[PDB]
Amino acid sequence: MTMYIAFILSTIFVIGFVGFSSKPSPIYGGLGLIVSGGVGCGIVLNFGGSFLGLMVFLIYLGGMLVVFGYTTAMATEMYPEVWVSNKTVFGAFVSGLMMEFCMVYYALKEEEVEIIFKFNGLGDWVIYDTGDSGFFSEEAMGIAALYSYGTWLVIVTGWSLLIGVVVIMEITRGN
Amino acid sequence: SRGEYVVAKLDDLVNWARRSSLWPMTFGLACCAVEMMHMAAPRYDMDRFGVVFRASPRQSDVMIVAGTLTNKMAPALRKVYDQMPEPRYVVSMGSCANGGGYYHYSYSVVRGCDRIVPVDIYVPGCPPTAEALLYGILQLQRKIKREKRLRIWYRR
Amino acid sequence: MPLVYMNIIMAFAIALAGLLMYRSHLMSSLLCLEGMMLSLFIMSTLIILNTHFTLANMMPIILLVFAACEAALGLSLLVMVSNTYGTDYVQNLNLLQC
Amino acid sequence: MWFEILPGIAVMAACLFIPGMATAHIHKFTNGGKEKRVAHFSYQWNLMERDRRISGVNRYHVTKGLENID
Amino acid sequence: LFQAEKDRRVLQMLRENLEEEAIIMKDVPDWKVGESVFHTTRWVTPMMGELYGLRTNEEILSATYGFIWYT
Amino acid sequence: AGRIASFLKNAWAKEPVLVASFAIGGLAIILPSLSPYTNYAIRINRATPYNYPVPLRDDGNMPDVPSHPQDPQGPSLEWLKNL
Amino acid sequence: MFMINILSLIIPILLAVAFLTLVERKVLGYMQLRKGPNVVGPYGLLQPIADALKLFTKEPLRPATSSISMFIIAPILALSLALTMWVPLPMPYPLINMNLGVLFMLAMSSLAVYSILWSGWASNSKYALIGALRAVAQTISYEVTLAIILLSVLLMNGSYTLSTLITTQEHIWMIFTSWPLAMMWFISTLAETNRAPFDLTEGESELVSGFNVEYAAGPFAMFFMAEYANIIMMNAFTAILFLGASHDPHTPELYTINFVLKTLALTITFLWIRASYPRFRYDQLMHLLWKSFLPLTLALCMWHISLPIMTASIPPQS
Amino acid sequence: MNIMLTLLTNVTLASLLVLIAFWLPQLNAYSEKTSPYECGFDPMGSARLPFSMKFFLVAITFLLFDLEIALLLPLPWASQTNNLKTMLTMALFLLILLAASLAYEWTQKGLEWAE
Amino acid sequence: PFFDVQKRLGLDLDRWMTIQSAEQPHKIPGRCHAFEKEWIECAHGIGGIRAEKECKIEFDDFVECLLRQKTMKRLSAIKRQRDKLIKEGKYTPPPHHLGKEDPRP
Ligand SMILES: CCCCCCCCCCCCCCCCC[C@@H](O)O[C@H](CO[C@H](O)CCCCCCCCCCCCCCC)COP(=O)(O)OCC[N+](C)(C)C
Ligand SMILES: CCCCCCCCCCCCCCCCC[C@@H](O)O[C@H](CO[C@H](O)CCCCCCCCCCCCCCC)COP(=O)(O)OCC[N+](C)(C)C
Ligand SMILES: CCCCCCCCCCCCCCCCC[C@@H](O)O[C@H](CO[C@H](O)CCCCCCCCCCCCCCC)COP(=O)(O)OCC[N+](C)(C)C
Ligand SMILES: CCCCCCCC/C=C\CCCCCCCC(=O)O[C@H](COC(=O)CCCCCCC/C=C/CCCCCCCC)COP(=O)(O)OCCN
Ligand SMILES: CCCCCCCC/C=C\CCCCCCCC(=O)O[C@H](COC(=O)CCCCCCC/C=C/CCCCCCCC)COP(=O)(O)OCCN
Ligand SMILES: COC1=C(OC)C(=O)C(CC=C(C)C)=C(C)C1=O
Ligand code: SF4
């Protein structure tokens, strides 16, 4: 019940997801995905994952810049659609909002199995760690272990990135 | 009265701010714009008075009509005058913009830009010297020092 | 599970549903794909942080890498489709039938 | 000027002085005058929490020395 | 020394919770006081919802987000 | 040995940036294997005590383990103070 | 007490931006054999106040064809982000102390580009659109190399914490160890702030007012303030990163004075560079950043990874 | 909490500046004043028409090169491991692979803009 | 299907990251290290079918550690009864549950 900050952030996450899933326009969809990336960074930050949250926010900012350029080039029309400019987009948006609100009320006032399992709430502070040790960040040590433990992961990842460059060059060649 | 004193002081402050920060459009037509550039040149340095050219009409406060206005050009001049946010001022520079000048009797020339837009100051000459245009700009500043907007609003 | 887990899973389901129902633009479906990737990143990060699994802190980075590869692939295909038709509408991809 | 450019630079320098000095003084005023503690890791946070508990006034900055151990 | 006093603090909080729950939960019929939820009989680290479950929300907030929000 | 020298001169005359980049990259690749202080860096990394050293139970058959931190047994950091 | 600190940070920054406008005008004037502002107020000391009062008493226009929500959101985002990017800077103590300050600046700066993107798109005019796509291209040009340069420089710091940079350079400036990286970083910060010779988005000769051409009055003013605050902030970051001031814990005023002097010198260098050079073509900026800067940056990153290991000079704080 | 307060303060100040800018001055809006600016003549088409991207291939390469930045950022912490020979081999392997990808795209004219 | 190349050559390509109880850097332990260790040891070498029945206790303890469902159930029951008692006015919570304690280091 403590300030409900994580619950509010996750609700805004879901709202941004509904925003871009209704597919109003690519320009608007990218804005919704940016908002979702920001609140997800916040959610991960509130759990001790500063590096991962900042990293995912930076990555999605770059991706959405490329997507904005591509939308201006290849996904435009005379009247771009907003969430209130079309009955289909508005209906999908309102349906998503109402589904989210219904699920929140359903799981908050009752203690019911939606699909997988049940949940009573209490705020996500309960399952925390009360761990008292360290001159280092455990997340940072785990991520840095990629260069000593994750040799195989580094190999496959680097190979896949090089292959991706070659692949995009082959795909866009045309002829 | 207290209200009269307050509105007079506020009017003074607003007028000072407006006249000390006068941004003309980057806009010239003919011979007179060369003298405009010489007014922007180091010897006269209009920027030292707070006068800075800006290209966009939405960021401009004054329009200097510097050169002949032809019939083909008049709709464009009117259009960029309409797109200036208010308050806005127009300065007519040179004989051509004043009343047509050397081309007053031509078939393709507007006989003075004041047929198309309202004009605040007329600068005579063909072309007026950069010093004369500076005098006209300072005269426009002195005219802006004299307006009573808040006092007239209070008197309503 | 807490409420945050249900919220993240709901976000994943919404993005999947978004991908499944196509409107006109291909780019919107690509955005839904990226949204699913982001939801999976958030869920995995929360699970790994909660259980203090130190060596698993590096998996979401790998997930992001392959998400970038997938997005690049989709964007290249979109470039080709648009060059063919002058539009990224999924209605134009109807030359092959069942 | 060329020395008439200097007054604007001096005003800018005075403006830019304010944030750092203000932050230093406000840190000192709210931490007993002794340079607000830094906790980049959980061990330092635990030390700060322990200090707060034993102070008796619920403030980490108040320090109990050898006079508190009879 | 920190380890010793942390052990004492955790044990004291657990004992206080045990006594207060024994006072509270005597009304209901079939509630064994202090009953564990694990089949094993070895020591298990408290979940911090078990140490701060009966305390004010300021203490809970400081115990959960105190280190994260200290900047 | 004669054509490659001319190639080097041409590259220096046309693409100095690439010449500098390749030289720096090659130096960074090959130098660390020829340096005597790489093992020194490894030892310094191994000497940083991030966690608590849990003591061992005395079974009476470990002459090499000190019974006190200031005893002569155990490892030494005297090599580090001279570095 | 914390709100007092926020205000004591954000108000002086706005005053510094206002007077940086005047300082830039005077420096450009004197490098051009003229004077610059010297009438409204002694030595043009009241010119910024007159400019601000004129702008905020001028009519704001909402274009008929424009998206209004994004059109209004973009300048708010610009100004708020410019203000926020100041809070982790240690002067010598930061307002907000972060474990990863550098990554925070990276993320917030890469978010700041959407101000230009969205203002240009939401204006619904052609010059604004051209400015916005130039912004896209500029970010694609500078981002990767900027990040790699930051990593290479920070490999000697030991962490991402900004305050550790003070103790790292306790004896020598970091510019004596990484001056090629310093040069590439300086050019990258010029490109990142849309400053000449990389002021492509505004494109005054080429694109009239570019991305902000539709904007007028108070909304226009916000964009200007954000840009100049970004100038000062990036130069302060450069001063902290490469010319490290010495900090006495019992006299932080000396550090503050020295750091402010250094960042003022870097800002004056920005103005000098603007006064001295012509503008790039925006494909040429991308070619410079991808064909000259990127290979050298990769090689220097390899070198700066190897060097501490070879010399047993690895920094602390894993 | 402090960072949230800072964000709220900055956003509030910017919003208040916009509010003052829009409610203080005198507004006189009419159709000519609010029409799109194209140097004094009416635009031919719409600004919402497709705008070609000549550097599309470099933009996709930016997506892949950006993710290798996320792989290289943990390097300052990776330098503190005991097995410095494995880590240094892997850091150079990733950077060599990234330089090879730039060399491939450069030689195949992938960096040249479309005409 | 599964070619155990790792087992045949003794390579350990990915086994290092499969479980939470396997050699973390700096010996940082997982939150449920003991439970997973006991479940693994109990089920080792008896096969999957036998393990699902004869190591059900250890697995149940491990899952309880992982998700902590019974713990929140018990805590919420205790708090509900306490709130019911205070609402009718028959508890009078102790001073150390209201912030007026005497803290120890
Ligand atoms: C039979 C056919 C052979 C040829 C085909 C090979 C196909 C796969 C490509 C590469 C083979 C993979 C084998 C290497 C697996 C990595 C793990 C192993 O080698 O041990 C590591 C040893 O690392 C060594 O450096 C070897 C790796 C060197 C990699 C060189 C690059 C080869 C990749 C080239 C092909 C990949 C695709 C093409 C991209 C260039 C770690 O040792 P260590 O750290 O002590 O112990 C770790 C445990 N700790 C943490 C408790 C301490
Ligand atoms: C709190 C933030 C919001 C408000 C910001 C307000 C900023 C402070 C105001 C700045 C005051 C300075 C302006 C006055 C300087 C003018 C100097 C003097 O020369 O002015 C003379 C007289 O000035 C005017 O008559 C009056 C100016 C001031 C009017 C009264 C002051 C009101 C201050 C109240 C501030 C409250 C703001 C509202 C708050 C909501 C006219 O001379 P001028 O023509 O120039 O020069 C001729 C050129 N020569 C010399 C080369 C030959
Ligand atoms: C730097 C940031 C922080 C600064 C801190 C101050 C922030 C100030 C808040 C931002 C707004 C500043 C604008 C100031 C000018 C006033 C604008 C508006 O509020 O006034 C009128 C608001 O009035 C409304 O029009 C109707 C009158 C009041 C509506 C009744 C609502 C019920 C209130 C109860 C009133 C009873 C007595 C109140 C005392 C208890 C609007 O008139 P309008 O012409 O359109 O707009 C143009 C204004 N002009 C004329 C100056 C050009
Ligand atoms: C050995 C370790 C390697 C790792 C370190 C290097 C790190 C990253 C550096 C490589 C990045 C990618 C390389 C890019 C390859 C460019 C290919 C190319 O096309 O080259 C031409 C230029 O032609 C060249 O190839 C340049 C010369 C040949 C390559 C440069 C030198 C190669 C190595 C020479 C030095 C070797 C080591 C130095 C020894 C010093 C001797 C004492 C580019 O010019 P254009 O853009 O096409 O011009 C068009 C306008 N008319
Ligand atoms: C013992 C082991 C040491 C390892 C080796 C270390 C030594 C390495 C020596 C070489 C380092 C050189 C670094 C320089 C990086 C860029 C060099 C470069 O070539 O860039 C230029 C481009 O660089 C520029 O021209 C800059 C453009 C923008 C100019 C803006 C104003 C100039 C800046 C004024 C002074 C800046 C001061 C920087 C530092 C400030 C303090 C931080 C290439 O462009 P072109 O000539 O057109 O040719 C490319 C195709 N053939
Ligand atoms: C440097 O600032 C100036 C301009 O902005 C680029 C101008 O356009 C002009 C007008 C001359 C050009 C060719 C339009 C002048 C005089 C000027 O000083
Ligand atoms: S008035 Fe004279 S100088 Fe000016 S434009 Fe006309 S002819 Fe040329």
JSON list of C-alpha atoms in Angstrom, two decimals, chain G residues 49-104:
[
{"chain": "G", "resi": 49, "resn": "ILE", "atom": "CA", "xyz": [15.47, 41.32, -20.25]},
{"chain": "G", "resi": 50, "resn": "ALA", "atom": "CA", "xyz": [14.05, 43.35, -23.13]},
{"chain": "G", "resi": 51, "resn": "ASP", "atom": "CA", "xyz": [14.19, 40.33, -25.43]},
{"chain": "G", "resi": 52, "resn": "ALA", "atom": "CA", "xyz": [12.36, 38.11, -22.94]},
{"chain": "G", "resi": 53, "resn": "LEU", "atom": "CA", "xyz": [9.71, 40.72, -22.13]},
{"chain": "G", "resi": 54, "resn": "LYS", "atom": "CA", "xyz": [9.11, 41.39, -25.84]},
{"chain": "G", "resi": 55, "resn": "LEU", "atom": "CA", "xyz": [8.76, 37.67, -26.55]},
{"chain": "G", "resi": 56, "resn": "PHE", "atom": "CA", "xyz": [6.39, 36.90, -23.69]},
{"chain": "G", "resi": 57, "resn": "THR", "atom": "CA", "xyz": [4.10, 39.84, -24.51]},
{"chain": "G", "resi": 58, "resn": "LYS", "atom": "CA", "xyz": [3.89, 38.83, -28.18]},
{"chain": "G", "resi": 59, "resn": "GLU", "atom": "CA", "xyz": [1.06, 36.81, -29.71]},
{"chain": "G", "resi": 60, "resn": "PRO", "atom": "CA", "xyz": [1.58, 33.03, -30.00]},
{"chain": "G", "resi": 61, "resn": "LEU", "atom": "CA", "xyz": [0.30, 31.39, -33.17]},
{"chain": "G", "resi": 62, "resn": "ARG", "atom": "CA", "xyz": [-1.25, 27.97, -33.58]},
{"chain": "G", "resi": 63, "resn": "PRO", "atom": "CA", "xyz": [-0.99, 26.90, -37.23]},
{"chain": "G", "resi": 64, "resn": "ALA", "atom": "CA", "xyz": [-4.23, 25.88, -38.93]},
{"chain": "G", "resi": 65, "resn": "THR", "atom": "CA", "xyz": [-2.77, 22.66, -40.34]},
{"chain": "G", "resi": 66, "resn": "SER", "atom": "CA", "xyz": [-0.73, 21.72, -37.24]},
{"chain": "G", "resi": 67, "resn": "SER", "atom": "CA", "xyz": [-1.33, 19.05, -34.60]},
{"chain": "G", "resi": 68, "resn": "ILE", "atom": "CA", "xyz": [-1.88, 21.18, -31.53]},
{"chain": "G", "resi": 69, "resn": "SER", "atom": "CA", "xyz": [-1.08, 18.68, -28.76]},
{"chain": "G", "resi": 70, "resn": "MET", "atom": "CA", "xyz": [2.38, 17.75, -30.06]},
{"chain": "G", "resi": 71, "resn": "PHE", "atom": "CA", "xyz": [2.92, 21.37, -31.14]},
{"chain": "G", "resi": 72, "resn": "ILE", "atom": "CA", "xyz": [2.54, 22.44, -27.50]},
{"chain": "G", "resi": 73, "resn": "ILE", "atom": "CA", "xyz": [4.24, 19.39, -25.94]},
{"chain": "G", "resi": 74, "resn": "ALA", "atom": "CA", "xyz": [7.52, 19.73, -27.83]},
{"chain": "G", "resi": 75, "resn": "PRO", "atom": "CA", "xyz": [8.86, 22.99, -26.27]},
{"chain": "G", "resi": 76, "resn": "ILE", "atom": "CA", "xyz": [7.79, 21.86, -22.78]},
{"chain": "G", "resi": 77, "resn": "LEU", "atom": "CA", "xyz": [9.80, 18.68, -23.25]},
{"chain": "G", "resi": 78, "resn": "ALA", "atom": "CA", "xyz": [12.76, 20.67, -24.55]},
{"chain": "G", "resi": 79, "resn": "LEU", "atom": "CA", "xyz": [12.93, 23.09, -21.63]},
{"chain": "G", "resi": 80, "resn": "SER", "atom": "CA", "xyz": [12.20, 20.52, -18.91]},
{"chain": "G", "resi": 81, "resn": "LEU", "atom": "CA", "xyz": [14.83, 18.13, -20.28]},
{"chain": "G", "resi": 82, "resn": "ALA", "atom": "CA", "xyz": [17.42, 20.92, -20.52]},
{"chain": "G", "resi": 83, "resn": "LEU", "atom": "CA", "xyz": [16.72, 21.78, -16.88]},
{"chain": "G", "resi": 84, "resn": "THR", "atom": "CA", "xyz": [16.85, 18.14, -15.77]},
{"chain": "G", "resi": 85, "resn": "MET", "atom": "CA", "xyz": [20.21, 17.38, -17.41]},
{"chain": "G", "resi": 86, "resn": "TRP", "atom": "CA", "xyz": [21.90, 19.59, -14.77]},
{"chain": "G", "resi": 87, "resn": "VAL", "atom": "CA", "xyz": [21.02, 17.70, -11.57]},
{"chain": "G", "resi": 88, "resn": "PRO", "atom": "CA", "xyz": [23.81, 15.04, -11.53]},
{"chain": "G", "resi": 89, "resn": "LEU", "atom": "CA", "xyz": [26.68, 17.43, -12.29]},
{"chain": "G", "resi": 90, "resn": "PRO", "atom": "CA", "xyz": [29.10, 17.59, -9.31]},
{"chain": "G", "resi": 91, "resn": "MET", "atom": "CA", "xyz": [30.02, 21.21, -8.58]},
{"chain": "G", "resi": 92, "resn": "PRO", "atom": "CA", "xyz": [31.77, 19.64, -6.51]},
{"chain": "G", "resi": 93, "resn": "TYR", "atom": "CA", "xyz": [28.65, 18.08, -5.00]},
{"chain": "G", "resi": 94, "resn": "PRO", "atom": "CA", "xyz": [25.72, 17.05, -7.19]},
{"chain": "G", "resi": 95, "resn": "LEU", "atom": "CA", "xyz": [22.08, 17.81, -6.51]},
{"chain": "G", "resi": 96, "resn": "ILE", "atom": "CA", "xyz": [21.20, 14.18, -7.28]},
{"chain": "G", "resi": 97, "resn": "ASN", "atom": "CA", "xyz": [23.96, 11.64, -6.63]},
{"chain": "G", "resi": 98, "resn": "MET", "atom": "CA", "xyz": [23.68, 8.70, -9.03]},
{"chain": "G", "resi": 99, "resn": "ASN", "atom": "CA", "xyz": [25.71, 5.53, -9.40]},
{"chain": "G", "resi": 100, "resn": "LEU", "atom": "CA", "xyz": [25.44, 5.92, -13.19]},
{"chain": "G", "resi": 101, "resn": "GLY", "atom": "CA", "xyz": [25.34, 9.62, -13.96]},
{"chain": "G", "resi": 102, "resn": "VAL", "atom": "CA", "xyz": [26.93, 9.38, -17.39]},
{"chain": "G", "resi": 103, "resn": "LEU", "atom": "CA", "xyz": [24.32, 6.91, -18.64]},
{"chain": "G", "resi": 104, "resn": "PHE", "atom": "CA", "xyz": [21.62, 9.23, -17.29]}
]
